[PDB]
Design a protein around this ligand. Structure first.
Ligand SMILES: N#Cc1cccc(CC(=O)Nc2cncc3ccccc23)c1
Ligand SMILES: [Cl-]
Lengths: 305, 301
């Protein structure tokens, strides 16, 4: 029993974290094989970030301008290239701790673990979701740029995020491992604002199933709803629309608990229009939306890595 | 900016997780140097669950009764001993991935990371606090026994917990790495109940300082309180009494935010009286008590 926000074990990723320095800027890099990936803004000064021409700044750099440190060993940069908002530093040494890995771009609503790093050293691991507005509500300080988001599929690490910046509201923006930003953000010190965030509906439903598996069943009701009536209500409360794909993905949890997806949707519809009434679900007074249906199955069934 | 429940990176601990089998029972073990630590209840059959005599059961076992597996390699048990509720299996191979480590016993209110494992394989990592009733509110399934609780100080893993059992309320009980249970619990199927849980007051205060550091100020007020008046109010909401030690420990956060501890204590009194009124503090509608003052300083600085 019990339900916790749970990150993937971070060991396979910790063995890839290195420190990358360019001039006065020091951030984190991900060392996989003989390439170190890091945000391209590591080559920027204070003036540069205001309006940077990254192609021009990178051409002016040499391999000896980049200092890469893996533990107490300095790696020598033998090449440098840029792929979108990510800098790729070719090193002379393949990372002997390179796990089986893949670069994946995630969709909003999907969850992943973040290994927050400072000076190439892992300091914490937490689980978050890519918000529907493409930001992540992370916990990052100065020096955390380059920290990565990942999932673990069997024995394969799927890198899905790299940290680039903090928006004025304290939320975070970053790219996939190919340097493509999640969301309408740019890597420049300029006024940027995330769109109004919405609740990840399929994740709330999955979390309601997790509560039922754990015996917390007060919110269950006799009612069911059509997917259209549910979406009309949910949209008014800034909840993401639930698609037939989401209903299908919630199928195994529906069969395990005996509560059809549209039956749980009528529980959610009531919770939205009326609140919790002083009650809690899994010790929470708010509906939790950072557990996907897969996360709930994995945690309530004990899948290992 | 931002505030998250954050676990320590689990790599140094993952390289220590092994699978321990004794008869039909399979659980996890912690492989450090040439010793594998695991719950001694791994040696129990169905008949030895209500009233096991562990000294008698262990004497009847031989090294070949224990099967230890580290990845795909079977380790050979060359010795076995018991220290309180933990079983120590001497192996003929020192763990090459043994980190710098230490065994620490923690106090209620202290936080740590749990690396939940099944069959010697790490499946997830989460953050916990030792509850004032000495239980932990973990997330564990059958087979999680031997999963460990830890903190990391620079390059050193301080092991503070080993999972042994689930109580009838779904909360968890375990021991330090010397086999001493936290709380009045025993490794027996006999009727056991945790005492009524209470809120870790010093941790709520630390979390209110974390919110202020992150720009939340709505719960602040112009009142201050005596420590005695605060404890009289807090006790009525099942909150732990705040001692002078707790006030002193909150000193650095008090100096960083410019809000004295007893000033923050009056904010906490008001939140307990009014509730949140549809507002949240750091995205939460309830007062969070699983962040110590040390955690808040670590994460914010
Ligand atoms: N010392 C001890 C001890 C005494 C009685 C029984 C046990 C076994 C025990 O409590 N296992 C479990 C742990 N953690 C989670 C569990 C979820 C479901 C079912 C069992 C779970 C251990
Ligand atoms: Cl599924």
């Amino acid at each position: 029993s019990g339900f916790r926000k749970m990150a993937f074990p971070s060991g396979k990723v910790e063995g890839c974290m290195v420190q990358v320095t360019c001039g006065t800027t020091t951030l984190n890099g991900l060392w996989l094989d003989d390439v170190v990936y890091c945000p391209r803004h590591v080559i920027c000064t204070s003036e540069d970030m205001l309006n940077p021409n990254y192609e021009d700044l990178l051409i002016r750099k040499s391999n000896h301008n980049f200092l890469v440190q893996a533990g107490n060993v300095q790696l020598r940069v033998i090449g440098h290239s840029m792929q979108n908002c990510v800098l790729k530093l070719k090193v002379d040494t393949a990372n002997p701790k390179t796990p089986k890995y893949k670069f994946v771009r995630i969709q909003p609503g999907q969850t992943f673990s973040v290994l927050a790093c400072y000076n190439g050293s892992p300091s914490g691991v937490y689980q978050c979701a890519m918000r529907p507005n493409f930001t992540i509500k992370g916990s990052f300080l100065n020096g955390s740029c380059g920290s990565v988001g990942f999932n673990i599929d069997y024995d394969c690490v799927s890198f899905c995020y790299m940290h680039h910046m903090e928006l004025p509201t304290g939320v975070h923006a970053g790219t996939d491992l190919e340097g493509n930003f999640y969301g309408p953000f740019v890597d420049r010190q300029t006024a940027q604002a995330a769109g109004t965030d919405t609740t990840i509906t399929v994740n709330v439903l999955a979390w309601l199933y997790a509560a039922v598996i754990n015996g917390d069943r007060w919110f269950l009701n006799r009612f069911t709803t059509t997917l259209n009536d549910f979406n009309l209500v949910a949209m008014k409360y800034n909840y993401e629309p639930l698609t037939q794909d989401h209903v299908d993905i919630l199928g195994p949890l529906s069969a395990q608990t005996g509560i059809a997806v549209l039956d749980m949707c009528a529980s959610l519809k009531e919770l939205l229009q009326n609140g919790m009434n002083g009650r809690t679900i899994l010790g929470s007074a708010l509906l939790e939306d950072e557990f996907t249906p897969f996360d709930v199955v994995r945690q309530c069934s004990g899948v290992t890595f």
